[model samples]
Target: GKIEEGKLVIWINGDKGYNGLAEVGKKFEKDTGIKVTVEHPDKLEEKFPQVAATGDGPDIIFWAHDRFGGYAQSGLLAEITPDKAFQDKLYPFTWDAVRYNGKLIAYPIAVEALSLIYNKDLLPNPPKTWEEIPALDKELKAKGKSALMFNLQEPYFTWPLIAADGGYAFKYEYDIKDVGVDNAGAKAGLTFLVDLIKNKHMNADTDYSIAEAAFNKGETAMTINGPWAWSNIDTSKVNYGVTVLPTFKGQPSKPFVGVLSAGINAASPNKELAKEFLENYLLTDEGLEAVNKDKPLGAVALKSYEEELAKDPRIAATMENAQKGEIMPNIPQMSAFWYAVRTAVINAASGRQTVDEALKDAQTGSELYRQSLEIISRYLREQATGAADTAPMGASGATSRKALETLRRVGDGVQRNHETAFQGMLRKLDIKNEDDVKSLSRVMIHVFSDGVTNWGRIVTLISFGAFVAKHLKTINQESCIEPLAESITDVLVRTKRDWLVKQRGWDGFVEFFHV
Candidate 1:
């Protein structure tokens, strides 16, 4: 990768969110003659792997901590080594997010977690536990208001409630294979979710927008959200107050703590410049102040900003709650939790399935998804070793053939055992044309926009395409295959090209397959 002279680039998700970077860039350009360009590309994370692999990408990327593991493991990120003095000035918890396998990978930006935001004008004081919420709802309903509301369908925001008991997506300190979503404690949490709906504390159909609207309009007394919700809520001026999430029974609610960070691209030729810019300018107190001014963060990770952030009660509560929360796992396997948890929670809340049934299904599906990665890793290793043993001259072709063979086997297996599930997806989607395919792809991008795209989702999408093509053949609509294939290609390229590139387009599948 060769450096572009007199230029440095950074990629972030939204156009206006990281505007402070532009200010930092201006100063850098004035001083070093390096034109710092901050790009707000749609789906930056989805396209990063492909772009970075081609030796063309931003020198720096602003992303959440969860995706750092995948990027660092795939060799897309450069390791950073902030001096001891600088490191000492940061909150110890902040370092955990930016490091991978004991190696520094990014500069930590902010610490964030979900909290209970209540309308002081409506409730005056927050309830202490889930059991109290329903009673509070009864009183609030007399005044034509509700006590509590949240995005009941989402795993991320609702995790505190789900994990209020001794529950978690994974036994993170131990094996990721040991999923706890269907354990007794999690089942209790699922039951509570149902009870909340049954008791009219939350709507089965409530999502982020609905909950946000209710809270902003002063229609809900309390809502579960993070510090990031302040910008929109501030405009409503509803006299809101933030507190740690309430308890379930005697257990404290434990939310998933997330850290936002800036990472340098390993393949960028301007690594030194990017690192210098980050260390000397962007990570400074002045730089962070500018960033916070442009867009409020959950909680600053630097000790220097601790006093400043504490001046706002909401930010102070967020910092305190984050200390009591669990760090969101950074492993790629964590990707399997979101879709499964959402399906289970929504299904149970909607009464389509019992709490027991929904949790069991989620556990089973998540286990399978986790195991599938291990299987892929094993197959890749086997093929790689086999290819090296025989025909070193044709090793590349041999390895690729083995990978294709593995894919065929996986497709056959899915079609044989999970035909009904794929059929269900087809029935639900009712995809009959290119337009429908485009719609589905767009929806996928929207759903997985928050850096949730991974090899597991990619494999599932590929299998769905194969099953659809075969079904069309059986129905004597073979003519549809070309357009369907073309549309699916477009979908995959747009949504999964980065992951494919990270996997080295089949020839390099062996890299990420290992534990």
Candidate 2:
């Protein structure tokens, strides 16, 4: 590879987030006479594709393996074929995440997975299996303690237990259409979780914050977590040790492994220069140290760093568990897995539905969504004029026309009814200003109820914002509309953006509403 004096740019979180590689970048510039610019851009993942499409984006992007498939499939990343020496340094398992369609598309830097974390002060010897946990739970309860606490609602933390019986969100190699989240093995895993809470071994209300707080306060003897917990635990002065999660009925607990990786942007002019920097500078022991100096970058993938990294017992334990972990699926459909697993686990654990019932509903919901995509595709194909042009209603022109009509209706309501409707709500709910708009949106969400399928929920949400805007217009509080609009956008994007993708976005709404 020929080295150049060109500047190589990277889009990533700043020094405080992930591996800033500040020292490595400085040394690369000093040694090679090549400039390295690391940018901390907000929404780099969302913006990278749009920017890269125009042949103007970073030379490198630091992100997790979950996005690898999407980026690779879109031809946004260049395949990295490293020398044997460099490949030898990385763990074979870490390579699985960076490879898409059998091409090595990125360099894997760190591997993160959940493991059994225990308070050594409370439990002298951690159990080896699920069967062993109840006996320990009995002992701990007598001493006014709990055993094996974790976030009850989060599938990410609970996946190992759920996967104990071969349960998975998709097939082993990931056939998106073949979802297994509601299968028999999944039921067994979920039952184990419900049983623990049912028997009072773990609190039912435990969330991410609550579980960490319980472990930190010594209220619980053990919890399932990763290295991130250690940062706070060391400060708390807790005597804790890490170990692999106990097996369930002789089946190993397989958690999801997330790989933090960096890839060369396919559009970059400095592709060879970028490759030289990553292979020689970033993956070296010195580079790895600089990357990890700010925070624990999970378990290091470089074999040369293992001896030193394994010295930290937390990383050692997490690495052992990570060996058996399944990589989080990288496909776009993987987004729905979160909703399916979260809904099923929370409902089952809360006793709102039986384990089987919850799983069935979850599976059915996923299948229904998959079928909807098929239906839309078929409809579009049938309506095509000897070609696969989009259906009339699915076109942007129709969507904009309908959107304008809806906006006009909302405007008319606000203009004419602000005196009566806005004034009535003020008397009923004591509404004062934009602060009360928060409560109004909450009412819209509950009233819409079935947020997953109902597009009306978003409509209700936006229309209520119009009412609030009208209320502000009466008082010359129009200055608040920008912030109010931003707030509304945040609510929709955070809560409903994933579902929006599944529905094919604006086109989906236009087709469904037939406006």
Candidate 3:
């Protein structure tokens, strides 16, 4: 009964999470007579569900806690109900990361978060507030010095400001409905970036290397970096301290805290052995202790280990900073940030885009882009495969075509019908759910995202979708243009679907398409 003498294969996403675990995995085999293989797929998150669908996924999957939402709902992630004693050993609020809805599915391994790294010679103490930063920037730079700098190109670095100012990319709730990057607080966060330039507190030249280069040479007084950059610094040149990022507008600056977790996959044939491995070698203090031998990645979730973890100044700072911020969500949406916000930040810093333009781009980038693809994908995968030549039809198609023509015309301006025609295009094209009508959406993204504003493309889309609202009204006017929720439910019920749908209901993509 000791690990039931079975083979256990666990999946890990990256080199970092697996380093410490490799020893522990070996130890489990030696001690328990179970064979263990720790698998690392370069794209585990993407590859997992696909593999799991074929029932060949590993016993456990090690990745950020964010991916839980997508995996859990599909019945692919098996839940764990640890006894009261085990739950009691956890750090405060760490439970929220592993708990989705009312069930606890995954085991939390560690907290990876950002903290303020300051040069001790320039400031004996970490700056505690936002106002202190710019003031310090002025003081140090005026003395012919650089006060503060960080990678302006990575939107991940900008998150502390956005978070502290009450700007969340998604509503903090588990419901993934609204993206908050365009809200007032987010604007303030974006403004803080541009304002820093206006105030002469930072230079546009700052980037990942330059920030590290400046601080390493003792050329900069302070910078926002993390433990990952710690070894990069030349310690003899600069004495640095790690602390929580400074507060802004009186609210604490909370960078994204990413949680690494170990989850049992529902599809694993060796579920019992997988559970036993986590309990015996990964989730336990002995498991964590084995890990800490390599580095303090000792499951930071265990209460008994906090004292040992605090011994390292880096671990102490990271766990402290992590507790203050929002836990990053594992939903599918998180993947979009790298492409969307990264570009926005780089463009703004490079002057290709304004602050407003940048935030808007990042804000709209993920959802709209995903939405278009979701619809296009569903059509392609579900019904429209090899039917790229399909065209719009009937009275519905005629009205929309006319509306676009009318809007495209000049001095048809003499007639006030453009508005009606424009609205009509959206509404008329809305129903019968014609193949050509839906087909334009696939091509529409090229025009909309052509990035450079072409009035022709803009006008065509505006006349077609200016009131996506108007089109939706007509859609609701139709019968069950339909429960894509029910559609999602049907997929989930299959027990062999390619994707997951939260068992209780479908919230994201079904709602995205409204069809």
Candidate 4:
């Protein structure tokens, strides 16, 4: 098919507020005649699934291998089996992540993995092992500084530490398979985390933004993060150093490498054109350079491009660390693995479970997902055979309804669990002030209700109402409370806010409402 003259759309998930993807798209369009439209969604996890489920995704998507497996398994990705020459031009590790079931599903764009980024002013020498980290942390803490930082709330940053302590999420043989979750090695890894938290060697308050800010301000001695942080980190205030994560019992910390690739949608009308774009523009030196200008941490196709990447001193260290990186699995089941791992780690970190119990729960959860997949596969096979036809109509219908009912019950159970947990957290936080509590309660109720009813309109109304509520407080307290209440009511509105306002008209509308 000849390429259509329509603009090529690409969806990029990154720090869009900082114009990260916008700058790259502008440069790409300038270099190539093709008009590349890039959309940066604030919530990529939610938005990507919606786009993918609808089969209305962009021509090219910049995504990591973590979610790649799920998309590919659903047959959402376009297979791009590059020519021998093109394959030769790409980095071996980068290419590995795009291969699912031995088919090339994406084109490599960038390679990223975690490394120990430390404030050189705080720690003259970064620790080489988990054991040494404590002493360093103690020394720094004596000077009113934290040794290391990571978001205890998010498990991604902490998983590497666990791995370094000899834990393995799953045992990888020739092909990946699940093992080692409840193994001794995993326990050791969990213990190390608990010890670090108990000793205050690592600050749990360090989220991605806070950690980057703290390191930039020289508040923390060290932190483990990826190269994406380089753009946000302020190197002017403090000298920084990067090295592979601290070793545990001589085992180097193996970071989960997040690879960005150009993936064509399977249903795209411009499939061949997208392939051509990937092979010619995206894989070429010039095209890679344009992308690198915006994403400097990216490892280019040619090894010769290393010099260009090294121009940024921080990236030079990141490149060195990438050698020990492990590409995340691009298998459909990988999503379940990530969720299971996150839940296990968080439970352990929060002291809700013993390390062994947490690992056991994680393993059990993973196995349940595997069993669910097996059940689905079996059902499809049974249908393919004459099993459904042989079965009585009432029996088949009853079974189908039971399956749907079970699914609904499971969903409801999860929702209730979340609500209960959230309420518990609020209670623990001692949110006793009536006004503050009421404000929070109203916001939560509206969010949950609107999320189910009319998401977009509710979002707009709530945002505008909040804005008005903020300004109104300064002018009229009564109006402010009403505006705040209206924000919640907006979620319950039968018609769109604008249409309702239009019907009511502008003058004396507030007075009429009082009646």
Candidate 5:
């Protein structure tokens, strides 16, 4: 009855909305007299930040571990370090994600990783390595089929290959200072990704919906997808089976685990009641089972569910493979890292640059962006002291003085043998120029302060009339005819010269002088 007097609001972000939470909420309310209200925002990322920033987030929220790193670092999460006793009871991988700076920020609910899902009707056995995939793809193509489907636009799908090649996006330590992007490991990983795109073994165009359709239609033999697709996949029409991701040169594919967890809002009015509801509803067997029934996501209590999960071949296979998987880092810098990795992969796969070149650029780009923030902080100090204005103004002033200082610190911090400041300068300028071009284009398209009817011709006619009026005094019979003809010809030539030069330069004149 005491629980019924209290209300707990939870927010979840997933395709299923809060359907999975509904049952558990009802049961918890009945048993503990606590009311649980759930909200599902289509754009959780956007909404969560706004709510978290104001310290008015939900009593409980569902999110993946990979995304948790950034939130924990920002102090957006409650320090659940005191709840380690409960955490120790959860699965090892699930527990790993909550340990940020030795603090527990969340409670694990479900776990997921990339695995090979193949049409049993197409092939009884799935390829186990990158080397074998091509041959399988070729074989499938000959039969008018694609070998694999994936969301190439998403970096998550490509991470396993990169990891298999021994490339890590972020290097983790007790402190965040050691994280890096560009390294030998990254180069090798990107190279393999480029090769996959060139060979056409994987369909990068196959997004989640398309991949499901393709699988149902038997258009593709296999795909790499998370357990989220399991419920939607039409198992009735296709004989399908799931297995661990294929190996690369004897290295097993290690997917970044997406751990769904529950966290209490620090600013919740009923903090104690909220914690009680979480412990009773989320951290219990009955509540978790209710949520896990329709969609058997990788549950956090492997020891308890292992026997039941072992009964299901698909769940068993996924769990076995998950043992080798890596928990996604829950650092605040992860968002930047994700963008950097995606850029590297897209650049390599799209042929904008070689894999090595793209990865190197990504590494450098990430460092510069991170350094610029520090630079801004340092400049704030200078501005506080009123010393920032003492420097000479010009091109340097036009650019970021703060950014330059930050780059200098970053360079000094890295201990690179060569000068790093110039690289930082180029990086800053490149981004600024890109922004300027976009801004100019936006103005030309959207801003209309002047009328737009043959403006060019109007200016030309006005100029021509002025020239005729200015030269009218020297009129004569033969002189008038010759002078008028020469004047008209000269006007036409000059007008054409300006237009041609601006449009196509000297090359155009040489190519079509007579015309």
Candidate 6:
């Protein structure tokens, strides 16, 4: 509601590296006549809470895309509603990261990835692409070391090699349905790895335990690793820097990218002005680029400026990999693929299985999981069938007769039916009561059971009670009162047993009541 605008504030992370977007706030104030301000705390975890407490002062906040859930759960975020047309401008995975429980919580701005980390003490200039690997390998060998130390068995570090040639382990939705790792592109990719190992150019040992220890101990000069690894390295012992991942056959080696985002805080009242500043300028490619002037090391999610950021490979690598990379499908199907495909590469690289035969076995292993899913799907449907069935159950003439008897026990001599119950009662009364005999002549009875009762039958029972309570009574009224009133209860239960059997069509005279 404060759109005529006094101010808009934004918070950015200080430790991980981002320059300020304060200039945008400055420029926005000039163009729109709304005053704007910027805020930066020294730390993130503590700062998010304090900034949120400030309410309208800090209208927009900066953070990792994953933190949207925490802020939104605390009632500190607003639902970000971008139009269908506007949402289409973003890459799908980037948009997905900032959405949780169906609300768009943030605006995706940049991608973060593992840069090619190297020690300056070992090599002043690292190679720009894998094509220079052979020369570096020979040079390092003279010093009794490998040129690069990286996990070969773990796909996290090695998947770029597989992806560089277009070999992937995904099938997107129903449009594609099989793992793409068994194709000719796959053969080319793994064969390249197998060539490196058998020729002894790289380290003969390819496992992660060996690779991780080798790099930390300075057994190797350059390695493929990420931001977390860069932070954990002992800077006192190692002088290191970053560059883009080297090219594989003229293509940049790809890494999985986590997109970082900015969003409006719920406490902001100037939501209209905040949306205009964030969507039109602050989260845009031009907007993201300005942050680079202040913070020089991180990746921007926008594809528009990556090639232009070519001067700084450290920043450019994160954007380039995410821009060109294949996103692994995030599904349960992938857990099985990791084991099967990782093992297939191991076997093919180790010479335990031929490169040609390894992936076919890999496909065999992958297909087995899909079949089990189908079996599980089929098993669930069968169990749901019984709960949906319906048919008439457990009804008979004797069943209805018994239900009436539950209300009042019929005598065996009275044919065990309501029609004769009153007749049996009269026999017990011995014609000693005159008023009782007169009432019986006017009354009628029918059996009651289950849900079957007609107006005609109910009307008959009504006449019985009326006949027994007669004001025109005669002869022995006092003696007849108890016997006649009690007898009327049995007469009231007589029913259309013949009508019921005809309705259902069986050997019996009446339909069996079913409730």
Q: Per-prediction count of colliding residue pairs? A: 0, 0, 3, 0, 8, 15
Please give the distance, in angstroms, between residue 348's alpha carbon in candidate 6 and its true position after superposition.
3.0
> Which segments of model 6 are wrong by more than 4 Å?
1-93, 98-112, 171-176, 204-209, 234-237, 258-313, 371-515
- Model 6, span 358-405: residue lDDT tens: 776665445433332222222222222223112221223243333333
For lDDT, the strongest prediction is: 1
Q: Model 2, stretches more than 4 Å misplaced?
A: 1-20, 25-60, 75-78, 81-85, 131-138, 141-144, 198-200, 203-205, 264-277, 307-316, 350-354, 365-515
What is the Cα-based TM-score of model 1? 0.69
Give each model's whole-structure lDDT.
0.72, 0.71, 0.62, 0.60, 0.60, 0.57
Report the Cα RMSD per candidate.
13.0, 13.5, 11.8, 17.7, 18.7, 24.7
Evaluate residue 26 in candidate 6 and report its C-alpha lDDT on the 0 to 100 scale: 71
Q: Arrange candidates by lDDT, highest first: which order? A: 1, 2, 3, 4, 5, 6
User: How many clashing residue pairs are found in candidate 2?
Assistant: 0
What lDDT score goes with residue 151 in model 2?
Answer: 83
Q: Which ten residues in a row have the lowest lDDT in candidate 3?
A: 496-505
Instruction: Quickly count the clashes in candidate 6.
Output: 15
Per-residue lDDT, model 5, residue 318, is 72
Error of 1 at 35 (Å): 3.9
Worst 10-residue lDDT window for candidate 1 reads 387-396
TM-score list, all predictions: 0.69, 0.63, 0.62, 0.67, 0.67, 0.44
Model 1 lDDT per residue over 1-515, tens place:
55474578898766234687789888888888888898889778768866876676888988778778768866788898889998887788788878888898898878878889999999888988887888899998999999988888678776787787877877755466677787888888779879989887788999888999999999999888876677778888989999978888788888888888889888788888887788777777887777777666777777787667878888878877777778887775455566668788988999998988888767655554334333343333333233322322132344445554666566456566787998897788776654565466555455443456665555555567666655655555555555555444445544554455344445444333423
